[PDB]
């Protein structure tokens, strides 16, 4: 019956990491995961893990009655780091939906960057076209069940605060308690990737970048808004922000006066004020404040592209429509 509309509560770790809980096996073994529209594979650390594994929950296949062996070796390369392991199959529970899934048991999890990760693994919300080993993604297997009210999933990311809700993922629809107004939809360029066409990025009331059009990957697993090194250099010059490591900074006192950043997607302009992209941790003229925007040279086929991560998602509640191959945005509350 197509009437299921399940949700997973997320935890906000310092506006950079948003993770929820999944259960693997019989009885269920729980894991903190990132739900990533940028990738299409499910992976958690394995009990068979020989640097970062000490700090994370490990999947023990020998404690699962529903486990089915596979063992195909697998390497999952990310913009942040790389993991390796082998494939396994078991039952996975995501907010009351149970699915037989092929996932990766990770045996190579480096302390850089995974020691910094508050989550154990990743649940890829991408398409099979981007899946490593051509492994069927979890959302495709939920679709096949015919339980969902709609072949959609939504993301709400809150601003860090207090016993408030860090975020929420809705499988089968959207939560109108978390958005204002109505959704505006933009069709995907092509199926296989959660990427839409962008028609310009403007600083203030004038179009500075992406004048001849560019790409925007709507990435739930990205912490920040990102662009090509060249684009981010031009943007940061316009903002009067200076480079300090892989971070861009402004003097904390100058933060509240930085201009609005606008992304032209579909029919409209999606605007971020300085309060949306500056980590305003002080207001002193002596201290330096971090911007939630950075350079990221995404390699082909996906890149060169901009990526609208948690910085964007916090402002705009996002709906990912698999039935219509489109992305919807509405102002978040």
Ligand X SMILES: C[C@@H](O)CN1CC2=C(C1)c1ccccc1Nc1ccccc12
**Chain residues 100-159 in contact with ligand NAG, contact rule CB under 6 A:** none
Q: According to the binding rule CB under 6 A, does residue 280 interact with ligand NAG?
A: no
Which stretches of the chain bind ligand X, using CB under 6 A?
17-19, 34, 36, 78, 80-81, 113-114, 116-117, 122, 221, 223, 310
Minimum gap (Å) between residue 194 Cβ and ligand X: 14
**Is residue 247 annotated as a catalytic residue, yes or no?**
no
* Three-state secondary structure string covering 169-191: EEECCCCCCCEEEEEEEEECCCC
Which of 15, 36, 120, 321 does the annotation list as catalytic?
36
Distance, CA of 152 to CA of 172 (rounded, Å): 5
- Picked from ligand X, ligand NAG, none, the partner binding residue 71 (CB below 5 to 8 A depending on kind) is ligand NAG
* 47 vs 70 by CB, closer to ligand NAG: 70
Minimal distance in Å, beta carbon 51 to ligand NAG?
28
Interaction pattern, residues 44-73, with ligand NAG; x per rule: CB under 6 A:
--------------------------xxx-
Contacts 24+ apart (CB under 8 A), 78-81: 78/39, 79/222, 79/296, 79/298, 80/113, 81/110, 81/112, 81/113, 81/114
Q: Which is nearer to ligand NAG, 71 or 299 (CB)?
A: 71
Shortest Cβ 100–ligand NAG spacing (Å): 13
Q: What is the token pair recorded at 135?
A: 């492994």
Catalytic residue, from 120, 151, 219, 321: name it: 219
Q: For ligand NAG, which is the closer residue by CB, 89 or 282?
A: 89
Closest residue to ligand X: CB criterion = 80
63 is catalytic: no
Which residues are catalytically annotated? 36, 219
List residues near ligand NAG by CB under 6 A.
70-72
């Amino acid at each position: 019956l197509g009437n299921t509309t399940s949700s997973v509560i997320l935890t906000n770790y310092m506006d950079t990491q948003y993770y929820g809980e999944i259960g693997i096996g019989t009885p269920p073994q729980t894991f903190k995961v990132v739900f990533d529209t940028g990738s299409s594979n499910v992976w958690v650390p394995s009990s068979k893990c020989s640097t970062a594994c000490v700090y994370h929950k490990l999947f023990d296949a020998s404690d699962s009655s529903s486990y089915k062996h596979n063992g195909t070796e697998l390497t999952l390369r990310y913009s942040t780091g790389t993991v390796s392991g082998f494939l396994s199959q078991d039952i996975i529970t995501v907010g009351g939906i149970t699915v037989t899934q092929m996932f990766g048991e990770v045996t190579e999890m480096p302390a850089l960057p995974f020691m910094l990760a508050e989550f154990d693994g990743v649940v890829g919300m991408g398409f099979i076209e981007q899946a490593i080993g051509r492994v069927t993604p979890i959302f495709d297997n939920i679709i096949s069940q015919g339980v969902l009210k709609e072949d959609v999933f939504s993301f709400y990311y809150n601003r860090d605060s207090s016993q408030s809700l860090g975020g929420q993922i809705v499988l089968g629809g959207s939560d109108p308690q978390h958005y204002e107004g109505n959704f505006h939809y933009i069709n995907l360029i092509k199926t296989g990737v959660w990427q839409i066409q962008m028609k310009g990025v403007s600083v203030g009331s004038s179009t500075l970048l992406c004048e001849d059009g560019c790409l925007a990957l709507v990435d739930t697993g990205a912490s920040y808004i990102s662009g090509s090194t060249s684009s981010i250099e031009k943007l940061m010059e316009a903002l009067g922000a200076k480079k300090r490591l892989f971070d861009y900074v402004v003097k904390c006192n100058e933060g509240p006066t930085l201009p609005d950043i606008s992304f032209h997607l579909g029919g409209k302009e999606y605007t971020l004020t300085s309060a949306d992209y500056v980590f305003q941790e002080s207001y002193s003229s002596k201290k330096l404040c971090t911007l939630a925007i950075h350079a990221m040279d995404i390699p082909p086929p996906t890149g060169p592209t901009w990526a609208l991560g948690a910085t964007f998602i916090r402002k705009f509640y996002t709906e990912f429509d698999r039935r219509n191959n489109r992305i919807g945005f509405a102002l978040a509350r």
